[PDB]
Design an enzyme around this catalytic site. Structure first.
Site, PDB file in Angstrom:
ATOM      1  CB  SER A  36     -11.843  10.029  -1.849  1.00 54.00           C
ATOM      2  OG  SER A  36     -11.617   8.912  -2.689  1.00 54.00           O
ATOM      3  CD  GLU A  46      -3.175  -0.575   0.101  1.00 50.75           C
ATOM      4  OE1 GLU A  46      -3.080   0.524  -0.487  1.00 50.75           O
ATOM      5  OE2 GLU A  46      -4.099  -1.382  -0.130  1.00 50.75           O
ATOM      6  CG  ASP A  95     -16.370  -2.754   7.072  1.00 50.26           C
ATOM      7  OD1 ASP A  95     -16.133  -3.902   6.627  1.00 50.26           O
ATOM      8  OD2 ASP A  95     -16.243  -1.727   6.367  1.00 50.26           O
ATOM      9  CG  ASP A 128      -6.587   5.756  -0.855  1.00 54.00           C
ATOM     10  OD1 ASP A 128      -7.745   6.097  -0.555  1.00 54.00           O
ATOM     11  OD2 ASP A 128      -6.353   4.839  -1.668  1.00 54.00           O
ATOM     12  CG  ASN A 155      -8.709   7.090  -4.324  1.00 54.89           C
ATOM     13  OD1 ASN A 155      -7.808   6.302  -4.603  1.00 54.89           O
ATOM     14  ND2 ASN A 155      -9.106   7.307  -3.077  1.00 54.89           N
ATOM     15  CG  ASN A 185     -11.079   6.322   0.221  1.00 50.69           C
ATOM     16  OD1 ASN A 185     -11.197   7.540   0.201  1.00 50.69           O
ATOM     17  ND2 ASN A 185     -11.469   5.554  -0.788  1.00 50.69           N
ATOM     18  CG  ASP A 214     -13.971   8.856  -5.234  1.00 52.03           C
ATOM     19  OD1 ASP A 214     -14.676   8.220  -4.425  1.00 52.03           O
ATOM     20  OD2 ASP A 214     -12.781   9.129  -4.994  1.00 52.03           O
TER      21      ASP A 214
END
Ligand SMILES: [Cl-]
Ligand code: NA
Length: 129
Positions: A50, A35, A101, A52, A46, A59, A48
């Site tokens: 956003s 990562e 989650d 990281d 990213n 994110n 969209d």
């Protein structure tokens, strides 16, 4: 800060990640490698809009606030900049919420594509733990 492999393993173990939700230490070290290349200051944007952040590339669309991702949530209730610190505590505590989650470590694309189903124990081989 750019961690060494065994240095990060020992840090993660101390913060309770070994076998957390059934994921052995090697899984976490492998994910961090691909990562962020073990660099706490890593950022990537990213499509969209956003971004990281940090050693586990968390994110801003869902997990932290950076003030420039409209309509996003802040489920770990932290500024995204807190995830870039040389102290990995904030990153680890947020990661614990993410992995719980329902989707486990599949939330991390690099883990799914480069760690899952491999011999991850090799990532902690030789370390003093
Ligand atoms: Cl799972
Ligand atoms: Na956000």
């Amino acid at each position: 800060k750019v961690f060494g492999r065994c240095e990060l393993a020992a840090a993660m173990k101390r913060h309770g990640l070994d076998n957390y939700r059934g994921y052995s230490l090697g899984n976490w070290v492998c994910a961090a490698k691909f990562e962020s290349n073990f660099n706490t200051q890593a950022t990537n944007r990213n499509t969209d809009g956003s971004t990281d952040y940090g050693i586990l590339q968390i994110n801003s669309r869902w997990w932290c606030n950076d003030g420039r991702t409209p309509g996003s949530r802040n489920l770990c209730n932290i500024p995204c900049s807190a995830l870039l610190s040389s102290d990995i505590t904030a990153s680890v505590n947020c990661a614990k919420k993410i992995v719980s989650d329902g989707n486990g470590m599949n939330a991390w694309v690099a883990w799914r594509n480069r760690c899952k189903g491999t011999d991850v124990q090799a990532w902690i081989r030789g370390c003093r733990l």
